[PDB]
Amino acid sequence: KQVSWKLVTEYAMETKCDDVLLLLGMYLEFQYSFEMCLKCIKKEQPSHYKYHEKHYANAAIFADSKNQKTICQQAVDTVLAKKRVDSLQLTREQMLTNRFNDLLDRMDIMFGSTGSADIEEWMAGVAWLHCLLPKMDSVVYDFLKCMVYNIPKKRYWLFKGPIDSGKTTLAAALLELCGGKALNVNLPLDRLNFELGVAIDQFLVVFEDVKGTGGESRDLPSGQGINNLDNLRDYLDGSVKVNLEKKHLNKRTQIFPPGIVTMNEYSVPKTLQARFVKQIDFRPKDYLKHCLERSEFLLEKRIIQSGIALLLMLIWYRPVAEFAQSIQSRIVEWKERLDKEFSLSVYQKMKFNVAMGIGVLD
Amino acid sequence: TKQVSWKLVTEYAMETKCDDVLLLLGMYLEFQYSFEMCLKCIKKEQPSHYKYHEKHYANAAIFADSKNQKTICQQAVDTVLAKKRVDSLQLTREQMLTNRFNDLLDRMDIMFGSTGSADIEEWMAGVAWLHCLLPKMDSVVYDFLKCMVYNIPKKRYWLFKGPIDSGKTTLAAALLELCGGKALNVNLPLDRLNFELGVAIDQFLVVFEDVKGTGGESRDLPSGQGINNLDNLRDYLDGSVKVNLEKKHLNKRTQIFPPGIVTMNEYSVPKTLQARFVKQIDFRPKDYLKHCLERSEFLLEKRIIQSGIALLLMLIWYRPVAEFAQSIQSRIVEWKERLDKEFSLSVYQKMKFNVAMGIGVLD
Amino acid sequence: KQVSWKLVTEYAMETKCDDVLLLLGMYLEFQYSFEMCLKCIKKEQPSHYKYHEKHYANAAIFADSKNQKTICQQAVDTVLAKKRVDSLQLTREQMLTNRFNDLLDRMDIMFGSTGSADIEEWMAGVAWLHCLLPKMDSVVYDFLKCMVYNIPKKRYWLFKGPIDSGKTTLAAALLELCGGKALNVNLPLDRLNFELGVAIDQFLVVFEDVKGTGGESRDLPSGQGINNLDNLRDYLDGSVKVNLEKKHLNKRTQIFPPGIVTMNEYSVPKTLQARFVKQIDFRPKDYLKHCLERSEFLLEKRIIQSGIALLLMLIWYRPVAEFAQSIQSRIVEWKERLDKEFSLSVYQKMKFNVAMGIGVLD
Amino acid sequence: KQVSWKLVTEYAMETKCDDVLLLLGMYLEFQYSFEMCLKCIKKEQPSHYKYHEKHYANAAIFADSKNQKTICQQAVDTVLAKKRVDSLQLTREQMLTNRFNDLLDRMDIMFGSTGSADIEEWMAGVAWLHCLLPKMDSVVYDFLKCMVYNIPKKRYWLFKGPIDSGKTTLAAALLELCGGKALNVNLPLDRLNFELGVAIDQFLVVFEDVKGTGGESRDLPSGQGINNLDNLRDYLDGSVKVNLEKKHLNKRTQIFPPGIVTMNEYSVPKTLQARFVKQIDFRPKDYLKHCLERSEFLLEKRIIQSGIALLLMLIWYRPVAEFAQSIQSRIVEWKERLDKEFSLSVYQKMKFNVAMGIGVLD
Amino acid sequence: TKQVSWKLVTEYAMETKCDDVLLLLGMYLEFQYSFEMCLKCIKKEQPSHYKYHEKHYANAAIFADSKNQKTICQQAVDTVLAKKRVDSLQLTREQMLTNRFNDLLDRMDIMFGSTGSADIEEWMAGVAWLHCLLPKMDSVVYDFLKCMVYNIPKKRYWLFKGPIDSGKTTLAAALLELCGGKALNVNLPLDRLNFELGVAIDQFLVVFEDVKGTGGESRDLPSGQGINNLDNLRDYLDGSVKVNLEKKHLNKRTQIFPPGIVTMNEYSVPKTLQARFVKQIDFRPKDYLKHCLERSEFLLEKRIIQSGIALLLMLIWYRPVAEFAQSIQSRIVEWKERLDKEFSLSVYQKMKFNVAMGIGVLD
Numbered sequence A, C, D: 001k002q003v004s005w006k007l008v009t010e011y012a013m014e015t016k017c018d019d020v021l022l023l024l025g026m027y028l029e030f031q032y033s034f035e036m037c038l039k040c041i042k043k044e045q046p047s048h049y050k051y052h053e054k055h056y057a058n059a060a061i062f063a064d065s066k067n068q069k070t071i072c073q074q075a076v077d078t079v080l081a082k083k084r085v086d087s088l089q090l091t092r093e094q095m096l097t098n099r100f101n102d103l104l105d106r107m108d109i110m111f112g113s114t115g116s117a118d119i120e121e122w123m124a125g126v127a128w129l130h131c132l133l134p135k136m137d138s139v140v141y142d143f144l145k146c147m148v149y150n151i152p153k154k155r156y157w158l159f160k161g162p163i164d165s166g167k168t169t170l171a172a173a174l175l176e177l178c179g180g181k182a183l184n185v186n187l188p189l190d191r192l193n194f195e196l197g198v199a200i201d202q203f204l205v206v207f208e209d210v211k212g213t214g215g216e217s218r219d220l221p222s223g224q225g226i227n228n229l230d231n232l233r234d235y236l237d238g239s240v241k242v243n244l245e246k247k248h249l250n251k252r253t254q255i256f257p258p259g260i261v262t263m264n265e266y267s268v269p270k271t272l273q274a275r276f277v278k279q280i281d282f283r284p285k286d287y288l289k290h291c292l293e294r295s296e297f298l299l300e301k302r303i304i305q306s307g308i309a310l311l312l313m314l315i316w317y318r319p320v321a322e323f324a325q326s327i328q329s330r331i332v333e334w335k336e337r338l339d340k341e342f343s344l345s346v347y348q349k350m351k352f353n354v355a356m357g358i359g360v361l362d
Numbered sequence B, E: 001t002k003q004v005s006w007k008l009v010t011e012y013a014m015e016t017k018c019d020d021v022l023l024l025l026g027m028y029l030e031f032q033y034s035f036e037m038c039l040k041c042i043k044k045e046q047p048s049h050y051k052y053h054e055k056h057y058a059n060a061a062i063f064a065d066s067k068n069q070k071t072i073c074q075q076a077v078d079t080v081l082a083k084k085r086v087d088s089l090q091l092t093r094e095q096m097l098t099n100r101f102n103d104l105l106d107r108m109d110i111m112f113g114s115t116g117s118a119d120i121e122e123w124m125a126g127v128a129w130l131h132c133l134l135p136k137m138d139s140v141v142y143d144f145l146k147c148m149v150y151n152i153p154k155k156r157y158w159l160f161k162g163p164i165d166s167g168k169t170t171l172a173a174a175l176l177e178l179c180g181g182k183a184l185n186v187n188l189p190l191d192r193l194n195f196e197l198g199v200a201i202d203q204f205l206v207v208f209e210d211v212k213g214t215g216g217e218s219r220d221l222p223s224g225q226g227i228n229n230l231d232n233l234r235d236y237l238d239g240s241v242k243v244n245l246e247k248k249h250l251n252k253r254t255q256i257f258p259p260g261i262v263t264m265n266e267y268s269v270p271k272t273l274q275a276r277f278v279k280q281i282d283f284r285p286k287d288y289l290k291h292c293l294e295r296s297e298f299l300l301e302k303r304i305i306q307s308g309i310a311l312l313l314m315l316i317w318y319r320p321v322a323e324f325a326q327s328i329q330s331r332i333v334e335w336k337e338r339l340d341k342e343f344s345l346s347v348y349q350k351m352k353f354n355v356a357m358g359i360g361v362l363d
């Protein structure tokens, strides 16, 4: 007759839910009969159907509790605590491995009998992405290594190029591939600290569309983004720990996460450039655009900016020995799944269509 | 022992989709008095009241004696907020719009029903006026809805541009109500931008109303910082990466910023920002639209032409049932029949004619 | 043995008290014996004498409570909840009607045997005000219609004119007549949202003495008031709901209230002028000035700036039919009272004195 | 059957944990059976394996508590209280000695049969660092003396030089060697006090990469860092106590900690220079760069920027007599360990390789 | 019983004048261990500890098991702050100074006693060096004290002005400690200005350290807003009307701002601001003072010349017993006798001579 706080926490931990309202909403859905539950029968959400039955009894009681929010708060704090421990005790490679396993879990479902994704359309995204930059699978691989090694002053990559050249598309994919947050430093430096606070315990960070000053010649608006980053050298450096605040108060002193900076060809101060271990210049390509025009599903289903598309790319191009030993078995399994559905020629055909700019699946 | 049921208050909040603690408190306290001698119920007036007073009388009676009224309402409101959060993350955007349409249809059943106070004839007149605001108006609205539903990266915002009193706000307000969402003001100092932007959390779409730019001294347009601010929010408009929205002195949600509309006078738009606008609609003042209104005061007095319900009526009247979500098609059919029963093509065409003539829409 | 929270709430509701400290102070007065209470017998304050005896028992216990503030907070929240429901469920005319009934209650007392107001001095105020603008009673009537109708983009009146021309006097009187708040937008926009939040659930708002820039010619100091208003087009239009915040405890998305803007002949951008349905230009008048010099009570007793003076004006000049059906019976009573105390010539004599610049009651 | 708050506090005290989420996370790991706990048997984390068995019983109960965060807060407050007492009552040498003992504790594990660190790779770091500046071990020794003596207006050292000259590398190592915080004063003054509040109860502080002006000729971006420092003369002097704040959390009036300032050779006002007892000019050296290119582990494992590398350097170079009496015996043990691991010539070869610009362990 | 005594904790805080919740928490937790073989008590390291461990052992043992440790300490600290508030409003300014002197003398009794670590000879050397910093130094200090005690409207602030390293901070810090008070920094933006000012609540005096002005760019002096900020705080320096000091998101106290000192380099001072300064002392660098220190490092290493105890020792050595408050006089006489037996006039004069010669003060 008493709610089990521990069970709510268990559910939060199992789904890695660190959103109090989301947790509250999800758990309240379990208060209803699992025997007569359509959400479970239709297998709509794993975070729901894989847990409804076990949590039914506790949820029924939870529904009558007067401290619902408080209970969920402790549950979420436990998830945050776990993330804090992992950030301090796991190797960065282990962190990425956990991320990859979560993505593979989503893949098993989305490409399984209860999924609505078409593996063929996703491989088409892999094809398009592999035409965006030279040796794309190596670019992605080298990025992962850079993020994992997290070497002082060799932690950031710069994505520079004209409008609609693919900077955000790839940055977004990489961000989802590794896990992390996108930060906006173009806003006033007043609320800057709080924006930077979002990076606490994150694997990596992406400073999106940072604006500079000298660029009115190229019809580029001026902003303080670049000046702001140049005032954050100890953040990009990753040598000394910085002081992040995320709760209207100082919450954590830590090495700032490594990451990416994307921008529109503004001038970059040498002091800031020294923080970028690699710079990639993106170039708009007619065929990529024309291909997208006839391959609308790549944007509508958000495939080319997905970390899942990048993960598939790695599974298709990279040798098993490069992946963490603990996950290799699972990788081999997906390599076999892919070979059984896409011959080399078929994939080559997709890339061909991209270069020709004529519908990837044509 | 006569203990108030928190679960019952929560159920009431859920059924009325009440996410306002004070509103919830005020409403529940009304169920405190006898259901028998209640003018509110017998005279109808408010569904959120008469459809629940009897069922909640007993619990409300106890609630009236509680020393934790606000706390109880808080948990009820949090449950409603939690449901909104789950839906924003788990429903398809089409399902979201469909839920919104069903809510509007519920209001329409009442307002145009026995206990209602609306005159369908006056609302259809609103449809007529709106159809003369832009070319192929019903297609403009349909295309807008698909854009909002598809939520395609960097192809999610429509720009409404034009002179004072050309219809930008009228249509934006109507679409905002049709889909559900919030209107944000980014003309205010960025020192409070995050707080305004935070209002977008869990919203279907957003409207950046009357954004001011620079270099507008030509058309006597006062300069402002709204355009510069939007250009600093490219990741918000793009909808590719999740943004960090703050609420209550604390970041409460990392999410893809909602798609939407930007309305503005004729200021210059930087290339970087223009790239985030999939479509631009140029609004133009029309004497006959003005003259028609002067003789059709009820359209403004009853807030009909700026209403999402007028647009829903338009969609029902013009679009094929097949274009609507499968789950609400039969409901759309009942309305098409209701409308066909109420108005012949001639009666409606006369309304559009009067509008084009700058005369009172009716008669 | 224990205090009845509901009783404190009933007192708050009956007195429409939404000020926690005022409520606390008032209820504590009821803890004393009422038998020989002079506040009661001399009927000094209705908020006191109509309730002391009834609340004595509960107040005596309240005085020994350890949660006085908390009890009154729930009471005030109930009052605020009622205002919230009313703002969303009553027609705007019903809102105005409720306000008029509250003013009439105050009038019943003021001009009653236990009141200290002289109805003749107040009618003198009506006379003076009726000489401030042409067809004043119609101006007030039209203003009320404008506020009730609350038509999109046709909701604000602009009071413009030189120093001491009567702008504030009339705006203050109208504010009290309808109920609402006066907002100062001449201060930094940084703390502007705070001020805008006071408009939550208000019937109308008055932006007092807004300063512009083009005014060197008239020795008028520059300010940001006009630019600030111009950044609030969606607030003035009243088409879409805006987002108001009343500190970290009461946010609200609602249509901004309609109202008034008063200013000193500064330049007004065409974009801002488009939000004003009517502009009234006030002019200083020597006789109005000379009259007041000889009718000091009009200022000392704050009569010409009172909503009660305007309500008396409407009662004297307007046809019963123009008032809401439910209040007409009461308006008739007051029309009879005014006719009993003032013949047409006696009232006309006050207007004569005003026009001639002499003591209104000469 | 009720959780022991004192035991959680003891665990926090033993691990010197002043991070509520970290504490919560670590203590929750103890709720699981330890009998066959691999984290324990494999001895992966001292903070875990040295306490799991002892805290299992209390932790199993804690897991069922509804006040987990509150329990952890009292525990963390105790750790913060202990640090506050220590900062006010211990001599600065005792503070440093306590830090050295904590570092030595980590060293016992790192280089132990259970550790993962290779003493050879760490001594290679000592060799590289010893080539960074002339008489490096004396530079570190003198720095320690300056920090311990904490002499008014003779407590800050300025590291100045071009990009990638070793300023941050050495400052980061000295910061970890002594314990303290790295502060960023390049950001706006708004949250300047927030950043400065981080210095509360810290042994020393490092103002990293302070931006100045008048450096356009050097292609150095302008900033307000130097200007900000010049407005903090009372902080740098350490004569009067200053007032530090951590929001509505922890406030404190204390003498500001002594420390380091690193910068890119901008101009320094005489007023500011007067607060720097010593200025070290760093210079890029081709061989140091070449050596690192062939000794990547020094950066990948963050060895040259480590306080442990510096402590090993002091142990190797400095006479036992210079260390605090209470720690001398432990220093002797380490000097014996090092002498056993490396002969004078074997260590000299490492320095030889660095000077030659080749792999340190080549 | 099994319950902690909050009253005892408060008593401990009151006796140690502890207004730091964390320090109080840390200190009381030390009493939970057996007093029997406590090393801290036998070694007589900290009075705040060894003089109370035995008495509080029992209560502390129970306190160690409490779940409301911080709450208990907060009530104790609040009591200390309440006492401070009462004293600020009800004691004469002389009594305030007297209580401060008595506290310093208590510290002197220990530091110069059998369990102390201070060398009276080294501190007397500090008096010697300081007496060489300005003409008639003992009279300067005396006059300063009278100015602070009298607290006369618009005659409450002294201005210390001079070049770098001339002794401004050295003397200001010593006087600050001698009288008790706070040092404020007004060179930082006025955003957090109200917060720094709040630090002066209930303080005897305030020191505005190193205030930067405009101009003076002719003497390599970086310009700042310090002076402009002080000129905007005229009602604070005047001390005629009460000002409103904020502390923790709210103006926690309306009071006469305390009197004090302002130190600065050679920047220009507006006449409006100069009018709040009753006395201006111009400090000047002296080679011999510098050379003396180079050969008397302990004066800086042990923070002697910047100490309030050095100035109290100076007053004791130079000032007539009659100048001290009646209540402390007998105590002052004891110290005068202690000093005379420790140092003959020629021995002290020799110290001043050495300073003047730029040689080690001692020997």
Ligand SMILES: Nc1ncnc2c1ncn2[C@@H]1O[C@H](COP(=O)(O)OP(=O)(O)OP(=O)(O)O)[C@@H](O)[C@H]1O
Pocket: A132, A161, A162, A163, A164, A165, A166, A167, A168, A169, A170, A209, A263, A264, A282, A283, A284, A285, A286, A288, A289, A292, A299, B153, B154, B234, B238, B240, B272, B275
């Ligand atoms: N190299 C490319 N060539 C042609 N079209 C591209 C290329 N990359 C992306 N696109 C197209 O442009 C869209 C947006 O790309 P994206 O957001 O990555 O650009 P950036 O991030 O390249 O540009 P911006 O500076 O405006 O942020 C994609 O949705 C796609 O249709």
Ligand SMILES: Nc1ncnc2c1ncn2[C@@H]1O[C@H](COP(=O)(O)OP(=O)(O)OP(=O)(O)O)[C@@H](O)[C@H]1O
Pocket: B133, B162, B163, B164, B165, B166, B167, B168, B169, B170, B171, B210, B264, B265, B283, B284, B285, B286, B287, B289, B290, B293, B300, C152, C153, C233, C237, C239, C274
């Ligand atoms: N195309 C039009 N032609 C003539 N009158 C119009 C038109 N559109 C709207 N109006 C009239 O002008 C009023 C204001 O319209 P609306 O708020 O939509 O304009 P905008 O939003 O067009 O202009 P603004 O730039 O001032 O915000 C309407 O209430 C209506 O009376």
Ligand SMILES: Nc1ncnc2c1ncn2[C@@H]1O[C@H](COP(=O)(O)OP(=O)(O)OP(=O)(O)O)[C@@H](O)[C@H]1O
Pocket: C132, C161, C162, C163, C164, C165, C166, C167, C168, C169, C170, C209, C263, C264, C282, C283, C284, C285, C286, C288, C289, C292, C299
């Ligand atoms: N039309 C008028 N003619 C002469 N005197 C007037 C007039 N109107 C108001 N006054 C005088 O001015 C006072 C009120 O002015 P307010 O109504 O305060 O002026 P504004 O609001 O007219 O001027 P301001 O621009 O300074 O705010 C009255 O108390 C009265 O003495």
Ligand SMILES: Nc1ncnc2c1ncn2[C@@H]1O[C@H](COP(=O)(O)OP(=O)(O)OP(=O)(O)O)[C@@H](O)[C@H]1O
Pocket: A152, A153, A233, A239, A274, D132, D162, D163, D164, D165, D166, D167, D168, D169, D170, D209, D263, D264, D282, D283, D284, D285, D286, D288, D289, D292, D299
């Ligand atoms: N004296 C040196 N000579 C050659 N290379 C060096 C030297 N010092 C450091 N480096 C190399 O440069 C990198 C960065 O050094 P560090 O962060 O200490 O420089 P700063 O702190 O010297 O420069 P910045 O002003 O950019 O912060 C090191 O990781 C190393 O590879």
Ligand SMILES: Nc1ncnc2c1ncn2[C@@H]1O[C@H](COP(=O)(O)OP(=O)(O)OP(=O)(O)O)[C@@H](O)[C@H]1O
Pocket: D152, D153, D233, D237, D239, D274, E133, E163, E164, E165, E166, E167, E168, E169, E170, E171, E210, E264, E265, E283, E284, E285, E286, E287, E289, E290, E293, E300
């Ligand atoms: N009059 C003096 N002549 C020579 N040296 C002095 C004098 N006063 C102080 N010093 C020396 O200079 C140091 C700093 O003095 P202090 O902090 O008081 O100067 P200011 O406060 O005089 O200068 P600043 O403007 O830099 O704060 C002392 O520690 C001491 O070594």
Ligand SMILES: [Mg+2]
Pocket: A167, A168, A169, A209, A262
């Ligand atoms: Mg982009």
Ligand SMILES: [Mg+2]
Pocket: B168, B169, B170, B210, B263
């Ligand atoms: Mg508009």
Ligand SMILES: [Mg+2]
Pocket: C167, C168, C169, C209, C262
């Ligand atoms: Mg006025």
Ligand SMILES: [Mg+2]
Pocket: D167, D168, D169, D209, D262
């Ligand atoms: Mg550096």
Ligand SMILES: [Mg+2]
Pocket: E168, E169, E170, E210, E263
């Ligand atoms: Mg100084």
Ligand SMILES: [Zn+2]
Pocket: A034, A037, A038, A039, A040, A041, A048, A049, A052
């Ligand atoms: Zn289910």
Ligand SMILES: [Zn+2]
Pocket: B035, B038, B039, B040, B041, B042, B049, B050, B053
């Ligand atoms: Zn009812």
Ligand SMILES: [Zn+2]
Pocket: C034, C037, C038, C039, C040, C041, C048, C049, C052, C053
């Ligand atoms: Zn009474």
Ligand SMILES: [Zn+2]
Pocket: D034, D037, D038, D039, D040, D041, D048, D049, D052, D053
């Ligand atoms: Zn274990």
Ligand SMILES: [Zn+2]
Pocket: E035, E038, E039, E040, E041, E042, E049, E050, E053
């Ligand atoms: Zn002891």
